[PDB]
Write a protein that binds this ligand. Structure first.
Ligand SMILES: CCCCCCCCCCCCCCCCCC(=O)OC[C@H](COP(=O)([O-])OCC(O)COP(=O)([O-])OC[C@@H](COC(=O)CCCCCCCCCCCCCCCCC)OC(=O)CCCCCCCCCCCCCCCCC)OC(=O)CCCCCCCCCCCCCCCCC
Ligand SMILES: CCCCCCCCCCCCCCCCCC(=O)OC[C@H](COP(=O)([O-])OCC(O)COP(=O)([O-])OC[C@@H](COC(=O)CCCCCCCCCCCCCCCCC)OC(=O)CCCCCCCCCCCCCCCCC)OC(=O)CCCCCCCCCCCCCCCCC
Ligand SMILES: CCCCCCCCCCCCCCCCCC(=O)OC[C@H](COP(=O)([O-])OCC(O)COP(=O)([O-])OC[C@@H](COC(=O)CCCCCCCCCCCCCCCCC)OC(=O)CCCCCCCCCCCCCCCCC)OC(=O)CCCCCCCCCCCCCCCCC
Ligand SMILES: CCCCCCCCCCCCCCCCCC(=O)OC[C@H](COP(=O)([O-])OCC(O)COP(=O)([O-])OC[C@@H](COC(=O)CCCCCCCCCCCCCCCCC)OC(=O)CCCCCCCCCCCCCCCCC)OC(=O)CCCCCCCCCCCCCCCCC
Ligand SMILES: CCCCCCCCCCCCCCCCCC(=O)OC[C@H](COP(=O)([O-])OCC(O)COP(=O)([O-])OC[C@@H](COC(=O)CCCCCCCCCCCCCCCCC)OC(=O)CCCCCCCCCCCCCCCCC)OC(=O)CCCCCCCCCCCCCCCCC
Ligand SMILES: CCCCCCCCCCCCCCCCCC(=O)OC[C@H](COP(=O)([O-])OCC[N+](C)(C)C)OC(=O)CCCCCCCCCCCCCCCCC
Ligand SMILES: CCCCCCCC/C=C/CCCCCCCC(=O)OC[C@H](COP(=O)(O)OCCN)OC(=O)CCCCCCC/C=C/CCCCCCCC
Ligand SMILES: CCCCCCCCCCCCO[C@@H]1O[C@H](CO)[C@@H](O[C@H]2O[C@H](CO)[C@@H](O)[C@H](O)[C@H]2O)[C@H](O)[C@H]1O
Lengths: 383, 57, 62, 139, 53, 135, 80, 103
């Protein structure tokens, strides 16, 4: 979304109340995260707590491993509720953006003020706390959805093009899953058909081998600030933490069937944090429930059985596929009755163009026959 | 202005061909899933036979 | 890449396309400048500069 | 028929290119120069072979106009710029750039004198800049 | 008027996908074609047998 | 907020200077947008007429620049050094004398390394002025 | 044929001998520019761009331009 | 859909290209530019005379001397420099007057 004066006024008016609300949310989220971190350190697996090293097979660069460095706390409901987890995730996003802004301010002293003016003129990178009314929150959500639309297609195309150019599926079912994975949101994708793509891509690329450019595109699509990007293991850590929290909340909801009892707005927010339900689509409860059930089905029974989610890259592609709107087409079909090269009519045809028209026109067969006969006669005379 | 446009232009034909093939594949899958369901219903001769028995004939 | 275009069969056809007309004009300039140089620089009345031994580029660059 | 161009080929022969399958083949066995179907496609043999398509007046059974609902997609975004609009913008920009470059070329190759001439009749001999001013303590 | 092709090409190029040939995807999709009536009959018979069993 | 980062933010109307732009594009497209105009890395086109037209024009303007701007400096230096060492001394001569001197310079250029060396080496016993004539 | 390095393109035949032999040639329908068409000289009857302007005339024009370029200073010399 | 080359304006695309596509090359280029302007941005008067002129240095007017004369006149006039100061001359003003009367 582009900046505007109205949004600038809105953010300037709500700047200090927004900061105060952000501080209160910071205290609350610090408490929640302290609880979660204590539980992880106490009951977490040895590899997860010790931060086991997983190196790539080509350049031996360490990155988070989905199996080892990600752990689902099935018993987190005792200490932390679902709403607390959602609050923590939202605060994590807001805190990331605020931390980047504060780092810029500290680095550049008082020279960041005009850049701050640019920042407050757009809702893309402002915290949710700056919105004090429903309309402001709706506009902020619209800006976030616009950024997601802007970013996701690049990530999807990167993944699909790299895989298709450097590899092909093994069997027909994998082919169908791969083809249906990257369909536009206007059609409904069956998670059962699409799931094998996860194993296929695990064969191709895991979350531990994700490239830095693809990571940048993903972070753009997740409304995660990317500047300064730095090494790939920082925003990678952010992504891992966010999706670990999301998986814990998803396990809690699936086990306790909270989504059925979840209200309409809370359900919409829950889907939105999973990048499943844009607000501009004006989805009803039926569609939200369908998408959430499809997401749970894609996670698969193994998620509940052992807390193991499918490949994170494929999961991100699948969820972001809802932001891959059909390519725009505006204009009545009658426009196809016009002509594009009328301005050349005055130039006419030169000798070469006339020759080409004569040779390849409706008389082409006659000219070909005459030419071939003449050439044959000349060749016979030569011999 | 020059390079990216040229490579996009070079890409266009293959992508068009692949998308046409994909649409044909979708139509083929739609057609292949169609089966006529011939149902079997209880023959009325048995019903007539039961009626006769109920009459004590 | 030299794939196609109008190609006159002989000299007389160079007037069948404006581009080749300009080309033949340029060729005429090119080839006719040489006889002009022959006439001008081998003329009977042409005289070497008397002061040619006063200075030369050879002493300057040396 | 008109003199307008067609889908670009790049001076390539589609019967031997690495993506030949993407080009439909007509009855005569000549692959098209474009994804469209071409009945009168031909091949010319210069130093290298190249495919050509000659536009012609041909009638095609035109399916009736559908409804706007089934082909229009109103997913346009503020950042989105259509190919036609882009072509217009680039045409105008390149026209102005061409005029500017023409003026520059004329000035450079017919009016601009070369610096540091032996006779001093044309061009500058150079001069100093950034000289101190109003700083007596500097000396 | 063929927006899908345009978008895919532009995105592929913008993500460093300069190459214009996709042999693997073509190999996966080259032999695709609408089936004949007899093939449809055979497929329907197969489906009916599967459903019955 | 001050300036847009998107090219979609137009500064003019779509019909601004439409006609001249269409004429310019017609000039550009007529010879270039053809199947046989296959470029080699955008620099070498396939149309013969493009070569036939552009090579002579390039040579003509380059030669005009070289003759009227570059070699003129050497010619003027020769005239000045050989006829007083000052511009006024040369201007003291007539136009015909300057023409003679410049044509002799052209002769020297044409001879280069493949010609007689008496044009710059004074044979012993020659009566013409030497290098110290003006010193 | 060739003019220096520029070679005249030639259309590849598309019809087989059997089909070709069945083709009836009617030059009456052909344009006047291309009648008795010869692959070795297809532009023999092509019209001139300017009526009465021969190739030799343009060649002589260029030669005259060269002569002017080389001889003008001889007749109208200018001082330094 | 969004693409950097088609949607963004030229300066924005330039910054993106040289920051997230070819940043190392830009850094090396800046390093080399700094080196060139720090070690290869000077030309002595003798070097200019030898090679700095197309046809050769015109000693008959010595434009370098005129250029330096203009430079020094401008500096003296603008900065109000007393060129008769003993440090410039190495002798007192009275000695300078005595020399002027002598010669
Ligand atoms: C205006 C300010 C100007 C600032 C200038 C200063 C420089 C810039 C500042 C910082 C800029 C911000 C961005 C920095 C990069 C961020 C990288 C990143 O994303 O890291 C994530 C990463 C976090 O990810 P993680 O998963 O937690 O851990 C990484 C994984 O292990 C990763 O796992 P892995 O699988 O990748 O494991 C490999 C990993 C393992 O490494 C690590 O990641 C571990 C951390 C680094 C350890 C480095 C020290 C190693 C031991 C050194 C021993 C030296 C002994 C010498 C004894 C001498 C005795 C005489 O990498 C390595 O192996 C690399 C080792 C380093 C090799 C160094 C080679 C240098 C060659 C020199 C050639 C010659 C030079 C010229 C000649 C000199 C001599 C004359 O961060 C870190 O690990 C540490 C980040 C540290 C950032 C830099 C801090 C800068 C502090 C500056 C203070 C001074 C300021 C001066 C100001 C002056 C006035 C203006
Ligand atoms: C005055 C001197 C200034 C020096 C120059 C500075 C120049 C600017 C550079 C940037 C400096 C920092 C700017 C503020 C950032 C805000 C604090 C923060 O870390 O936020 C958390 C957050 C952590 O991100 P993350 O990815 O979630 O962390 C993953 C970890 O696994 C997270 O671990 P976890 O998963 O277990 O979760 C823990 C989480 C759990 O907690 C929570 O969730 C609760 C929330 C806690 C964080 C709240 C942050 C709030 C931020 C907004 C503040 C208000 C802004 C208001 C603005 C308007 C004001 C009018 O709690 C944390 O966030 C703790 C993080 C670790 C502490 C880092 C701070 C270390 C420095 C401070 C101590 C310095 C001592 C000096 C001693 C001197 C002795 C001589 O920070 C960021 O978003 C990262 C910074 C983004 C900008 C990076 C820019 C490049 C930096 C390069 C630095 C290279 C070295 C320096 C030399 C530079 C030369 C070129
Ligand atoms: C009070 C407030 C509260 C307190 C403070 C709180 C903290 C605030 C600070 C933190 C805020 C963070 C968030 C900021 C968000 C907004 C950022 C932004 O700018 O967005 C674009 C923003 C518009 O954003 P938007 O419309 O909302 O669209 C956002 C979209 O989402 C589009 O989004 P996008 O992602 O597509 O856009 C991103 C775009 C952002 O960039 C841009 O969009 C470009 C912006 C500039 C465009 C300028 C175009 C016009 C040029 C005009 C030229 C002059 C014309 C003639 C003037 C004549 C005057 C007489 O690209 C980048 O991100 C590129 C990043 C490049 C990083 C460069 C790093 C360099 C590192 C160097 C290498 C080091 C290596 C290591 C070496 C180590 C050695 C040891 O741009 C503008 O508004 C344009 C402003 C133009 C101003 C006028 C022209 C310049 C005037 C200069 C005056 C100089 C005066 C002094 C002269 C002295 C001479 C001696
Ligand atoms: C046709 C001609 C047109 C005109 C052309 C003009 C001529 C240009 C010629 C050259 C152009 C190419 C130059 C390339 C250089 C090499 C770049 C390179 O190697 O980068 C590697 C690498 C590439 O960056 P990346 O993170 O991988 O991704 C870059 C993408 O653009 C990230 O993209 P993304 O999509 O992933 O993220 C988008 C979004 C994502 O959103 C976010 O990230 C959220 C918002 C983040 C806000 C910023 C957070 C910063 C946190 C602290 C960073 C560390 C600070 C270190 C300490 C301070 C050092 C100064 O981020 C933004 O929107 C960024 C907004 C930044 C706006 C400012 C851009 C520059 C405009 C000019 C302003 C300055 C003018 C000074 C000169 C005039 C003075 C009168 O750079 C870095 O790692 C970034 C380090 C940044 C350090 C701070 C800047 C150091 C440079 C000196 C600053 C001097 C400030 C002076 C202030 C005023 C004094 C009077
Ligand atoms: C308000 C501006 C900002 C003010 C300051 C702000 C605060 C500080 C900022 C950061 C300072 C960094 C300090 C040094 C860090 C380490 C590097 C180092 O060793 O530096 C050596 C030296 C600095 O000296 P120093 O170490 O501070 O100590 C003094 C020593 O005593 C000297 O000892 P030395 O032996 O090294 O001395 C030799 C010479 C050494 O000087 C050099 O070698 C000069 C090198 C210049 C590098 C420029 C980098 C950017 C290039 C971009 C790409 C250009 C492509 C090619 C384009 C060609 C056609 C234009 O030193 C100098 O005299 C330094 C003068 C530097 C003047 C900088 C002027 C930049 C003009 C850029 C024009 C761009 C035109 C684009 C037009 C496009 C239109 C469409 O050079 C530099 O640092 C060069 C980079 C300076 C960057 C400044 C910040 C960005 C630019 C702001 C001004 C923009 C003006 C635009 C005008 C447009 C007109 C149309
Ligand atoms: C007729 C004679 C002909 C001679 C010809 C000789 C060959 C000439 C070839 C020229 C063309 C090819 C050039 C190739 C490139 C060469 C590059 C090169 O050598 O550059 C070296 C030079 C060295 O610079 P320097 O010469 O100023 O070195 C300073 C050293 N002291 C102070 C001891 C004198 O690089 C530069 O000039 C650029 C310096 C600025 C940019 C780098 C800054 C960061 C430095 C980091 C380390 C130190 C700081 C601490 C860390 C950072 C903290 C923030
Ligand atoms: C930000 C300024 C705050 C203070 C108020 C200054 C007002 C000065 C008087 C201005 C009168 C003329 C205004 C004409 C309309 C200007 C519109 C404009 O700014 O558009 C920017 C437009 C580019 O737009 P895009 O990026 O393509 O897309 C825009 C949509 N996002 O820029 C232009 O075309 C240049 C227009 C320049 C207009 C003059 C601006 C003068 C600003 C001076 C500020 C300094 C203070 C002046 C005080 C004056 C006191 C009498
Ligand atoms: C400038 C620096 C800013 C830093 C900002 C971040 C600070 C974060 C502080 C977190 C403190 C957590 O507090 C710490 O938790 C761990 C894990 O439960 C406890 O750890 C305890 O239980 C674990 C798990 O059984 C044991 O492995 C450990 O031996 C034992 O000490 C510590 O006893 C406690 O001190």
């Amino acid at each position: 979304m582009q900046g505007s004066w109205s949004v600038l006024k809105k953010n300037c008016s709500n700047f200090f109340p927004g900061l105060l609300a952000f501080a209160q949310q910071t205290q609350e989220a610090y408490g929640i995260w302290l609880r979660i971190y204590n539980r992880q350190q106490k009951y977490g697996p040895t590899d997860f707590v010790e931060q086991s090293e997983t190196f790539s097979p080509d350049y031996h660069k360490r990155f988070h491993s989905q199996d080892k460095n990600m752990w689902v706390d099935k018993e987190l409901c005792t200490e932390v509720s679902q709403k607390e987890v959602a609050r923590l995730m939202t605060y994590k996003l807001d805190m990331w953006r605020m931390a980047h802004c504060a780092g810029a301010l500290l680095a550049t002293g008082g020279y960041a003020i005009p850049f701050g003016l640019f920042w407050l003129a757009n809702d893309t990178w402002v915290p949710s706390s700056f919105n004090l009314t429903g309309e402001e929150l709706r506009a902020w959500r619209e800006a976030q959805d616009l950024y997601r639309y802007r970013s996701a297609p690049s990530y999807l195309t990167d993944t699909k093009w790299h895989f298709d150019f450097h590899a092909y599926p093994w069997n027909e079912t994998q082919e169908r899953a791969w083809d249906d994975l990257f369909e536009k949101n206007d059609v409904r994708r069956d998670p059962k058909v699409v799931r094998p793509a996860a194993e296929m891509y695990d064969g191709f690329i895991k979350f531990e081998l994700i490239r830095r450019k693809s990571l940048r595109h993903l972070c753009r699509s997740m409304n995660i600030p990317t500047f300064p990007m730095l090494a790939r293991l920082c925003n990678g850590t952010r992504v891992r933490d966010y999706w670990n929290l999301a998986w814990c909340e998803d396990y809690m909801v699936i086990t306790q069937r909270l989504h059925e009892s979840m209200t309409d707005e809370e359900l919409y927010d829950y889907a939105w944090r999973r990048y499943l339900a844009p607000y501009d689509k004006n989805l009803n409860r039926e569609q939200l429930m369908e998408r959430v059930e499809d997401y749970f089905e894609f996670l698969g029974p193994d998620f509940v059985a052992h807390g193991k989610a499918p490949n994170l890259v494929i999961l991100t592609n699948y969820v972001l596929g809802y932001y891959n709107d059909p390519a725009y087409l505006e204009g009545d079909i009658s426009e196809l009755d016009k002509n594009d090269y009328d301005h050349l009519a005055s130039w006419g045809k030169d000798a070469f163009l006339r020759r080409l028209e004569f040779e390849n026109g409706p008389l082409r067969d006659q000219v070909e026959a005459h030419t071939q006969r003449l050439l044959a006669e000349r060749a016979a005379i030569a011999k | 202005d020059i390079m990216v446009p040229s490579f996009v232009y070079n890409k266009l034909p293959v992508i068009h061909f692949l998308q046409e093939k994909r649409a044909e594949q979708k139509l083929r899958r739609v057609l292949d899933e169609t089966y006529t369901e011939w149902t079997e219903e209880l023959d009325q001769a048995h019903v007539t036979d039961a009626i006769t028995r109920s009459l004590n004939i | 890449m030299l794939l196609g275009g109008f190609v006159p069969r002989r000299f007389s056809q160079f007037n069948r396309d404006p581009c080749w007309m300009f080309f033949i004009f340029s060729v005429g300039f090119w080839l006719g400048e040489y006889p002009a140089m022959m006439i001008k620089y081998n003329a009977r009345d042409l005289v070497y500069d008397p002061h040619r031994y006063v200075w030369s580029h050879h002493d300057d660059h040396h | 028929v008109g003199n307008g161009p067609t889908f670009s080929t790049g001076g390539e022969c589609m019967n031997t290119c690495d993506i030949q399958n993407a080009f439909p083949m007509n009855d005569r066995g000549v692959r098209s120069s474009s994804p469209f179907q071409e009945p009168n496609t031909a091949i010319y043999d210069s130093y290298l072979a190249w495919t050509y398509f000659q536009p012609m007046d041909v009638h095609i059974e035109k399916l009736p106009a559908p409804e706007a609902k089934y082909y229009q997609r109103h997913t346009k975004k503020p950042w989105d710029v259509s190919s036609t609009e882009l072509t217009e913008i680039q045409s105008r920009k390149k026209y102005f750039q061409t005029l500017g470059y023409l003026v520059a070329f004329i000035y450079l190759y017919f009016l601009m004198p070369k610096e540091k001439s032996f006779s001093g009749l044309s061009g500058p001999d150079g001069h100093w800049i950034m000289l101190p001013k109003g700083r007596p303590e500097l000396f | 008027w063929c927006p899908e092709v345009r978008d895919r090409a532009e995105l592929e190029v913008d993500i460093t996908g300069w190459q214009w040939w996709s042999p693997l995807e073509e190999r996966r999709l080259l032999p695709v074609r609408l089936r004949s009536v007899n093939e449809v009959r055979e497929i329907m018979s197969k489906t009916q047998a599967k459903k019955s069993a | 907020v001050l300036f847009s980062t998107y090219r979609s933010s137009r500064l003019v109307s779509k019909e601004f200077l439409h006609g001249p732009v269409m004429r310019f594009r017609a000039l550009g497209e007529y010879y270039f947008q053809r199947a046989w105009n296959g470029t080699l890395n955008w620099a070498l086109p396939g149309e013969y007429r493009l070569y036939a037209v552009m090579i002579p024009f390039i040579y003509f303007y380059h030669r005009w620049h070289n003759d009227h701007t570059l070699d003129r400096d050497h010619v003027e230096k020769a005239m000045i050094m050989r006829w007083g060492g000052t511009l006024e001394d040369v201007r003291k001569l007539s136009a015909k004398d300057q023409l003679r001197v410049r044509c002799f310079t052209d002769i020297e250029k044409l001879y280069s390394a493949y010609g007689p060396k008496d044009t710059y080496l004074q044979p012993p016993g020659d009566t013409l002025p030497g290098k110290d004539f003006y010193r | 044929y060739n003019m220096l390095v520029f070679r005249d393109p030639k259309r590849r035949p598309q019809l087989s001998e059997e089909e070709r032999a069945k083709v009836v040639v009617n030059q009456a329908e052909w344009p006047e520019e291309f009648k008795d068409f010869d692959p070795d000289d297809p532009y023999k009857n092509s019209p001139e761009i300017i009526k009465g302007m021969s190739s030799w005339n343009l060649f002589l024009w260029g030669v005259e331009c060269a002569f002017i370029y080389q001889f003008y200073e001889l007749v109208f010399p200018k001082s330094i | 859909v969004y693409t950097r080359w088609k949607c963004d304006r030229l300066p924005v695309f330039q910054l993106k290209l040289f920051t997230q596509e070819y940043p190392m090359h830009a850094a090396v280029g800046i390093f080399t530019i700094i080196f060139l302007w720090k070690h290869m941005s000077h030309c002595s008067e003798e070097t200019e005379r030898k090679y700095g002129w197309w046809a050769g240095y015109p000693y008959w007017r010595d434009p370098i001397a005129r250029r330096n004369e203009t430079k020094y006149k401008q500096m003296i006039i603008n900065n109000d420099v007393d060129i008769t100061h003993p440090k410039w001359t190495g002798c007192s003003v009275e000695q300078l007057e005595e020399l002027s009367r002598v010669v």
